[PDB]
Swiss-Prot record, chains A, B:
<comment type="subunit">
    <text>Homooctamer.</text>
</comment>
<keyword id="KW-0285">Flavoprotein</keyword>
<dbReference type="InterPro" id="IPR000415">
    <property type="entry name" value="Nitroreductase-like"/>
</dbReference>
<feature type="binding site">
    <location>
        <begin position="22"/>
        <end position="26"/>
    </location>
    <ligand>
        <name>FMN</name>
    </ligand>
</feature>
<comment type="function">
    <text>Involved in the biosynthesis of cobalamin (vitamin B12). Catalyzes the oxidative fragmentation and contraction of the isoalloxazine heterocycle and the cleavage of the ribityl tail of FMN(2) to form 5,6-dimethylbenzimidazole (DMB) and D-erythrose 4-phosphate (E4P). NAD(P)H is only required initially to reduce FMN and oxygen drives the oxidative fragmentation.</text>
</comment>
<keyword id="KW-0169">Cobalamin biosynthesis</keyword>
<dbReference type="GO" id="GO:0009236">
    <property type="term" value="P:cobalamin biosynthetic process"/>
</dbReference>
<dbReference type="GO" id="GO:0102919">
    <property type="term" value="F:5,6-dimethylbenzimidazole synthase activity"/>
</dbReference>
<comment type="similarity">
    <text>Belongs to the BluB family.</text>
</comment>
<keyword id="KW-0520">NAD</keyword>
<keyword id="KW-0521">NADP</keyword>
<dbReference type="GO" id="GO:0016705">
    <property type="term" value="F:oxidoreductase activity, acting on paired donors, with incorporation or reduction of molecular oxygen"/>
</dbReference>
<dbReference type="GO" id="GO:0000166">
    <property type="term" value="F:nucleotide binding"/>
</dbReference>
<feature type="binding site">
    <location>
        <position position="100"/>
    </location>
    <ligand>
        <name>FMN</name>
    </ligand>
</feature>
<keyword id="KW-0288">FMN</keyword>
<dbReference type="Pfam" id="PF00881">
    <property type="entry name" value="Nitroreductase"/>
</dbReference>
<dbReference type="InterPro" id="IPR050627">
    <property type="entry name" value="Nitroreductase/BluB"/>
</dbReference>
Amino acid sequence: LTAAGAFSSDERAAVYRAIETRRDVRDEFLPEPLSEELIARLLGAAHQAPSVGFMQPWNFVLVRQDETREKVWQAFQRANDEAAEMFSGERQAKYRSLKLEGIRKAPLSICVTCDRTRGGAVVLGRTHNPQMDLYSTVCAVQNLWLAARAEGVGVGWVSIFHESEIKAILGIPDHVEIVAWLCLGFVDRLYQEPELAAKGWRQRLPLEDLVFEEGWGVR
Amino acid sequence: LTAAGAFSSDERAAVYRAIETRRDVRDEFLPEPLSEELIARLLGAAHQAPSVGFMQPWNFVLVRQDETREKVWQAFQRANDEAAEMFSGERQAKYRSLKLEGIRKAPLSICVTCDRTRGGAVVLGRTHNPQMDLYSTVCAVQNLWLAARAEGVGVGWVSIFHESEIKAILGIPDHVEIVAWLCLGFVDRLYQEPELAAKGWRQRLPLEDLVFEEGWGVR
Ligand SMILES: Cc1cc2nc3c(=O)[nH]c(=O)nc-3n(C[C@H](O)[C@H](O)[C@H](O)COP(=O)(O)O)c2cc1C
Ligand SMILES: Cc1cc2nc3c(=O)[nH]c(=O)nc-3n(C[C@H](O)[C@H](O)[C@H](O)COP(=O)(O)O)c2cc1C
């Protein structure tokens, strides 16, 4: 190991700037393809996330064809109407007004998966909670989401669809599970607070109400 | 919604630095207490994470007492004994020589939970994959891991336990699930590559092997 400590004031500020201004983007994606170099940078950041037992359970399928985007978007529509019919009155009306994906518009999409069987028979750290491998994959997603913002690339996670329909589109095996579908593209503008808060779907919870001391429920 | 774009060369480098140099720390934690302000910043960061339907399913149980850390440590050991047992001969010995937690060393520990029933009867984006709320919570963890790195603070995830045991020690309800136990403390030395690689457990996988173009298995 080598010497380490806190970043400089400017370095820490750049770190919190990405964490604080990254948004989940749906409708602001610009049409320019992301350079090959920029993509390698984004995947690299993801590849450096931590992973249980250093399993590195992830795979990334790059999707850049209209044909594929169309099939995925339709799978979204089928699922989204279904989700829509799970609400009523004004909350349903409000649900149908939200943009929940940017699939056909984002010049790039990425389906991040988790190979449940990588790492051999037994994987360190996943001996007691088997979901840790999936969680590892999410860490890879956030690292990319954060790297993306710094590059001025908007990223949007889309989870509205029946998994099996997507695995069919991409040919993903049974031992591999989809963790996320991500829409990517440059942006020249972002919301300053979560879009769902601005559109009145749900507001930011008071952090002070979610922190306990020693025991659950104890402030 | 306002104008936005890529970070400056220096800001981008800072974000990538945290991403590339952060590690899972187990045995280098320092006894020095973290200030309440430093803890607010780390928690603030996590709370800036994305969350399905803006669910914000997380809660953070700060642990700072010797007695709690002792009970939690015993839990770890039992779990870890039965885990080591799952490896044979050569590998088992290697497993046993690894340090997989700094529960007793870390001056601060944080149990990050996910309330499966928050957000109402139905929660946006979580109508097809009921796991999206846990995934959201992992995003919170990764933001805290990254901010912590910039603060010169180390973070170590420990998942080798029998969850039911930890829930009982912290008095966590049935509708709430533990996503992660994070050990925290200042750190002045960090491995230059994942500790498990340096110790011969698993090497870094070749990213080129995990990226596909358009469909699974296609280069
Ligand atoms: C696991 C997960 C799944 C998500 N799925 C969707 C989705 O399907 N459609 C969508 O518009 N947003 C989706 N989101 C984004 C949240 O709605 C978003 O985090 C929040 O409303 C805005 O957060 P932000 O302003 O930090 O981006 C998802 C987020 C997470 C963490
Ligand atoms: C979901 C998850 C659970 C983990 N659980 C443990 C654990 O129980 N004990 C441990 O020593 N490390 C644990 N780790 C850390 C990994 O072993 C470590 O991230 C990897 O070997 C190299 O990580 P780094 O690049 O962060 O150093 C966990 C990581 C993840 C993502």
